[PDB]
Design a protein around this ligand. Structure first.
Ligand SMILES: CC(=O)N[C@@H]1[C@@H](O)[C@H](O)[C@@H](CO)O[C@@H]1O
Ligand code: NA
Length: 355
């Protein structure tokens, strides 16, 4: 938005400095995020995407519950800065806005630079699952329905494909046919949740690497951010999504596919950290599905990118017309390598489950 509008928004919130600037910030695809600079502290200002999260009240209730519980254990988290009237968010001119304190002395990554960073990510998200187990499912109502229900995502994909609103399907038949041909694989986790062979757990549901902040000195995890999708699911959604984003040798939107590979060493590092924290709760069936959960979440995210391309880019932020096609192509390349390396990942999990 204009500066006039953004500075106006900021005046609704209990900031503790005179604002000097408000500038676009970060690589989130969903909300619209800004860095607020002041004569003292920094803030993150976000316009929440109400097309994706229509029930703002329930969403903020969940975020308040999670963050207040962390605070009450003396654990660093996202610190909501209230409105000047004490509310957790503001509805202003038809938009929903919130502010968080900027988390100082941190670093974050869109791409794993070395195995230790990714091991730490695994530990952080594994620990967060232990934390979340303290809630029962009823305390944290779903903020998005069918969120990691891959068969439901596939129904959405098939509809986007049949409609082919922009005539973009002609240019991406290999990608389309990849997702169509893997239809038989999409129900495995949902079927296990439904029949009780996979435990229903409270999960984070968007565990990509850039949703953790690490300390700039110690390298240890400081805080997990992007708390909007905390809701019931499977452990496998958090593990699989982490592998999807972080076991790649390339960015999610890397144009040069020759740079995109699935790294079994990174898979190992993350699994060491994650299982390291969850060894006392992980079931045999969950352990059996750890490698395939990577395939599943990567395919789910990929099909969502491609569906969005076919629909004219209505869901994910994009920077250029082909951006979602570029994104779906990395996800496909990753799954192709995950398939080829299946025996190796199976062996890695077995080896860690004996440690
Ligand atoms: C709420 C929502 O749709 N979040 C998505 C997440 O599911 C997806 O895996 C990611 C891809 O980078 O983008 C967004 O964060
Ligand atoms: Na739906």
């Amino acid at each position: 938005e204009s500066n006039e509008v953004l500075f106006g928004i900021a005046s609704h919130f209990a900031l503790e400095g005179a604002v000097t600037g408000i500038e676009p910030y970060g690589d989130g695809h969903i909300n619209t995020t800004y860095l607020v600079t002041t004569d003292g502290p920094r803030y993150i200002l976000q316009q929440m995407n109400t097309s994706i999260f229509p029930d703002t009240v329930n969403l903020m209730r969940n975020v308040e519950l999670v963050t207040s519980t962390l605070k009450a254990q003396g654990k660093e988290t996202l610190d909501i800065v209230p409105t000047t009237s004490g509310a957790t968010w503001a509805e202003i001119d038809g938009g929903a806005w919130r502010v968080y304190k900027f988390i100082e002395h941190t670093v974050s990554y869109n791409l794993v630079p070395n195995p230790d960073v990714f091991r730490e990510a695994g530990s952080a998200f594994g620990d967060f699952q232990n934390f979340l187990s303290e809630f029962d499912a009823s305390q944290l109502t779903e903020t998005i329905a069918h969120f990691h229900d891959t068969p439901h995502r596939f129904e959405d994909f098939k509809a986007a494909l049949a409609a082919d609103k922009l005539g973009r399907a002609a240019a991406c038949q290999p990608e389309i046919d990849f997702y169509l041909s893997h239809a038989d694989q999409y129900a495995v986790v949902m079927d296990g949740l439904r029949d009780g062979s996979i435990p229903l757990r409270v999960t984070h549901n968007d565990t990509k690497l850039n949703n953790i902040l690490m300390d700039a000195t110690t390298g240890k995890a400081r805080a997990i951010i992007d708390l909007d999708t905390i809701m019931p699911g499977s452990m496998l959604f958090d593990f699989g999504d982490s592998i999807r984003f972080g076991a790649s040798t390339a960015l999610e939107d890397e144009k040069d596919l020759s740079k995109v590979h699935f790294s079994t060493e990174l898979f190992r590092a993350y699994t060491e950290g994650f299982v390291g924290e969850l060894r006392g709760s992980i079931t045999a069936r969950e352990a059996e599905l750890l490698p395939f959960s990577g395939n599943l979440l990567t395919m789910e995210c990929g099909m969502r990118f491609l569906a969005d391309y076919l629909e004219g880019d209505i869901y994910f932020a994009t920077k250029y017309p082909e951006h979602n096609l570029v994104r779906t192509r990395t996800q496909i390349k990753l799954v192709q390598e995950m398939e080829q390396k299946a025996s190796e990942t199976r062996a890695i999990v077995a080896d860690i489950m004996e440690a």
